[PDB]
Amino acid sequence: KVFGRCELAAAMKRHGLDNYRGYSLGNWVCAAKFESNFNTQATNRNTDGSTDYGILQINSRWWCNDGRTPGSRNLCNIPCSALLSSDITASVNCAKKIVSDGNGMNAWVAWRNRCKGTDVQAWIRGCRL
Numbered sequence: 001k002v003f004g005r006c007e008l009a010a011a012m013k014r015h016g017l018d019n020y021r022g023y024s025l026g027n028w029v030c031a032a033k034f035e036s037n038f039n040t041q042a043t044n045r046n047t048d049g050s051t052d053y054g055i056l057q058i059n060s061r062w063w064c065n066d067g068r069t070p071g072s073r074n075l076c077n078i079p080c081s082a083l084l085s086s087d088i089t090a091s092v093n094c095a096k097k098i099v100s101d102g103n104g105m106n107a108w109v110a111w112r113n114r115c116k117g118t119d120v121q122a123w124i125r126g127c128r129l
């Protein structure tokens, strides 16, 4: 599923991401935009053999099991395919665990490089929230 900007903002808010660990809603919408272009089916392979999955491009090395990343942890206790679902619950629930680990939203490369220090409120402007 390819979300609309405001439709994603409302689902993230419903799941409790607005101000989760001090990160306003605009940060999560910005990160989803640059990580997956709002597509729940997005996958990208890395050089180390790991794979990033879903709307928030959650990596198979630490967070999920895809059965092909040797010596990898499954810290969110889920199959990576659960992160490609049109329902974002698993992606949101796993993202809350990642953002809590100590590095905050810096775990998402595209957030650090394209959202961090910008006007992230613009990503929710015009939405009925």
Ligand code: NA
Binding pocket: 060, 061, 062, 063, 064, 065, 066, 069, 072, 073, 074
């Ligand atoms: Na894994």
